[PDB]
Structure 1
């Protein structure tokens, strides 16, 4: 948009953090796994990544996005990461109810390290903006979408195509 880059439920929202564009290298980040272990970029060294960023896996749109990317992306080939400001406890409980023990869900709630490094903090809400970044094994950002209106879905096919084409 003209004042802020995106909206959430139609309300203008300011994105905070470093801007990252296609062609840039991936910044580092420090996030928490479902058991509170620190996880950083280097833990996925040597792999291509599809990073699906969601406002809250406890909402319907985010839930479906996590499911579809995990189902549609080849996990034999690279790594699908879901990152949000949900507490690790909500992510853990979501994976258990879904009966999905193959799905990686990481929490940026404590420092917003991921959000500030990738330019996807929704500042008025302290949630991460709906977004998708595809990284190759050299951590080149080959694809980025920040969804314009955060209650809409991301373009799934374009991100899957970018991940597959690596």
Structure 2
């Protein structure tokens, strides 16, 4: 439940989700402010990429890398953050991509509290990756020890590709 951000200590708030666990449901907002839950993606595997903010460089590169390198005819790549939906929509437009799913946890921190990734001091989500199988079993998890560092892309992408 303890990480660092920019070198300073950060306490993670919420339920601890571990590999082998059943992944919890949640409620977030799409870019048009429709509510979205795990049920929208039933029957597919999911790479859930969690970032502090898509308007920062590391998070931007993480979102692009996972969306470029992971296949999407086999499953879903979700980006979840505390950015407002309006920032996420603008982000997709400015990147010139129309194939990228961004979801906002800003209103309730439903996702962050259910997955244990709320940086309590900042009201931002901790940099993390969760890989869910098509049965929403958590097959792979990383919470990045220092939030300004990149995640292990290759480990997460491999877990996702291999189901």
1:133 positional shift: 0.2
Partner of 2:79: 82
C-alpha distance after superposition, 1:67-121 (max 9, x if no partner):
0000000011100000000000000000001111100000000000000000000
Partner of 2:46: 49
1:35 positional shift: 0.5
1:5 positional shift: 1.5
Separation in structure 1 between the aligned mates of residue 71 and residue 161 of structure 2, nearest angstrom? 8
Separation in structure 2 between the aligned mates of residue 5 and residue 123 of structure 1, nearest angstrom? 11
Q: Any unmatched runs of 5+ in structure 2? A: none
1:47 positional shift: 0.2
Separation in structure 2 between the aligned mates of residue 92 and residue 163 of structure 1, nearest angstrom? 25
Q: Any unmatched runs of 5+ in structure 1? A: none
Q: Secondary structure at the match of 1:14?
A: strand
Separation in structure 1 between the aligned mates of residue 2 and residue 49 of structure 2, nearest angstrom? 19
Separation in structure 2 between the aligned mates of residue 165 and residue 102 of structure 1, nearest angstrom? 22
C-alpha distance after superposition, 1:37-65 (max 9, x if no partner):
00001000000000000000000000000
Count how many residue pairs are aligned between Structure 1 and Structure 2. Answer: 163
- Runs of 4+ in structure 1 deviating by more than 6 angstroms, as ranges, are none
Report the aligned-residue RMSD: 0.5
Separation in structure 2 between the aligned mates of residue 68 and residue 60 of structure 1, nearest angstrom? 12
1:25 positional shift: 0.5
C-alpha distance after superposition, 1:107-143 (max 9, x if no partner):
0000000000000000000000000000000100000
1:29 positional shift: 0.4
